Structure 1
Amino acid sequence: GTILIDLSPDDKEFQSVEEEMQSTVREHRDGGHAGGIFNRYNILKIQKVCNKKLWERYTHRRKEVSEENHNHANERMLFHGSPFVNAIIHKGFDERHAYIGGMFGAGIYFAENSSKSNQYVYGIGGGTGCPVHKDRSCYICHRQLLFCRVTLGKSFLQFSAMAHSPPGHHSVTGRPSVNGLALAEYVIYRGEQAYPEYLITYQIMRPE
């Protein structure tokens, strides 16, 4: 029961989502190996994801977490990249298909840096790149990210040197401590704690 509403570039909601994509690009320590070499995106489309059952599932869990956390859902808007974005928007996030080999445990991963999420769009470490050209830095093929509403509740703070949530915590904050320009990553252990609100289609742009 998911429908996708296409947003006009003139819509303020399009502009604020775009800004959140563009302004959270950073350089990656892999020199572009996983996600490609770029400083910005060409945003081709932004669609709002609408699915009543998934939304009600989201807001129900949110109220639970809120009540376990001095009335604070600790809701963020975070990026998620994956080859299975088309399954996430119809069926929601599935915690049995989590990142099993994740740095912060088996669970569903999100990023503050759009470019970190961009690294997973074609697979872990970027897989083998785009399906057409096998190119992790393809400037031609269309990529997709989700910009998602995520309940973190009480988040366990894990500093990093870059399954189930810790007892009495609702999520994990994975916070880089060596790269001072790297923003955080987050892990949730329940699919109902994220709702995939926006589906963003884009290309990476070749630096001039």
Structure 2
Amino acid sequence: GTILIDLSPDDKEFQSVEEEMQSTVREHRDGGHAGGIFNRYNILKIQKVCNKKLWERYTHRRKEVSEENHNHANERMLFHGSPFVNAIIHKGFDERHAYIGGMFGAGIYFAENSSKSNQYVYGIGGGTGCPVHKDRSCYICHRQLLFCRVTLGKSFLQFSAMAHSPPGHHSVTGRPSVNGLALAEYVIYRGEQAYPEYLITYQIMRPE
């Protein structure tokens, strides 16, 4: 049921999604080990992910959460990187997409920093890198991230450097507590609380 609609680079929607991707790059404490060494991306394509059944699954859950949280879904647009991006856009997020060994438990993880999600494109810790060159810093191979609409509801705040949500909460927020430049990361425990709205194809760019 999924169709992918190409956005033109001239379209304001392409430009605003590109700007969120580029402006949320940061340096990582691994010196680039997992995701590569880069300061910016070459955006090759942005596609809108259109699936009516998956969208309605998302909005149904969104209304449930909103009604449990004084009419406030606490909806964000967050990045997701995963070896399973093809399955996610066709089947929806579910338990198979969870980070079993995540620091906040087995849930589905999202990032404000696009470069944090980029660390998971080829697997946990970047796996063995791109399939063609086995290079975690490959500048040649095409990568993909999702930019997703995510319902947080009442989020449990974890200060720090599938399972169930903490009771009375709909998600967990991992607040950066050491690295002052890090943006927040978030975990949901129900696949219905994210919709994979944009599929972004890109390369990391070698700094000059």
Structure 2's unaligned 5+ residue stretches are none
What secondary structure, in the 3-state scheme, does the structure 2 residue paired with 1:54 have?
A: helix
User: 1:124-145 CA deviation, whole Å, 9 max, x = no partner?
Assistant: 0000000000000000000000
What secondary structure, in the 3-state scheme, does the structure 1 residue paired with 2:5 have?
A: strand
Q: Is the 1:162–1:177 contact (alpha carbons within 8 Å) kept by the matching residues of 2? A: no
Q: Give the superposed CA RMSD.
A: 1.7
What secondary structure, in the 3-state scheme, does the structure 2 residue paired with 1:49 have?
A: strand
Q: Tell me which residue corresponds to 2:34.
A: 34
Q: Tell me which residue corresponds to 2:135.
A: 135
Q: Which whole-Å CA distance do the structure 2 matches of 1:148 and 1:30 have between them?
A: 25
With normalisation by structure 1, the TM-score equals: 0.99
Structure 1's unaligned 5+ residue stretches are none
Q: Which whole-Å CA distance do the structure 1 matches of 2:109 and 2:83 have between them?
A: 14
Q: Which whole-Å CA distance do the structure 1 matches of 2:173 and 2:18 have between them?
A: 24
How far does residue 97 in structure 1 lie from its aligned partner after superposition? 3.8
Q: Is the 1:162–1:178 contact (alpha carbons within 8 Å) kept by the matching residues of 2? A: no
How far does residue 162 in structure 1 lie from its aligned partner after superposition? 23
Q: Is the 2:79–2:147 contact (alpha carbons within 8 Å) kept by the matching residues of 1? A: yes
What secondary structure, in the 3-state scheme, does the structure 1 residue paired with 2:62 have?
A: helix
Q: Which whole-Å CA distance do the structure 2 matches of 1:162 and 1:91 have between them?
A: 17
Q: Tell me which residue corresponds to 1:78.
A: 78
Q: Which whole-Å CA distance do the structure 1 matches of 2:202 and 2:116 have between them?
A: 15
Q: Which whole-Å CA distance do the structure 1 matches of 2:138 and 2:160 have between them?
A: 30
Residue 175 to residue 162, structure 1, CA distance change in 2 (3 Å): farther
How far does residue 94 in structure 1 lie from its aligned partner after superposition? 1.0
The alignment of Structure 1 onto Structure 2 pairs a total of residues equal to 208
Q: Which whole-Å CA distance do the structure 2 matches of 1:115 and 1:3 have between them?
A: 26
Q: Is the 1:146–1:200 contact (alpha carbons within 8 Å) kept by the matching residues of 2? A: yes
What secondary structure, in the 3-state scheme, does the structure 2 residue paired with 1:140 have?
A: coil
How far does residue 98 in structure 1 lie from its aligned partner after superposition? 1.1
Q: Which whole-Å CA distance do the structure 2 matches of 1:168 and 1:162 have between them?
A: 17
How far does residue 10 in structure 1 lie from its aligned partner after superposition? 0.1
Q: Which runs of 4+ in 1 moved over 4 A?
A: none
Q: Is the 2:4–2:50 contact (alpha carbons within 8 Å) kept by the matching residues of 1? A: yes
Q: Which whole-Å CA distance do the structure 2 matches of 1:113 and 1:99 have between them?
A: 17
Q: Is the 2:117–2:145 contact (alpha carbons within 8 Å) kept by the matching residues of 1? A: yes
How far does residue 96 in structure 1 lie from its aligned partner after superposition? 4.1
What secondary structure, in the 3-state scheme, does the structure 2 residue paired with 1:62 have?
A: helix
Q: Which whole-Å CA distance do the structure 1 matches of 2:3 and 2:161 have between them?
A: 40
User: 1:99-139 CA deviation, whole Å, 9 max, x = no partner?
Assistant: 11000111000000000000000000000000000000000
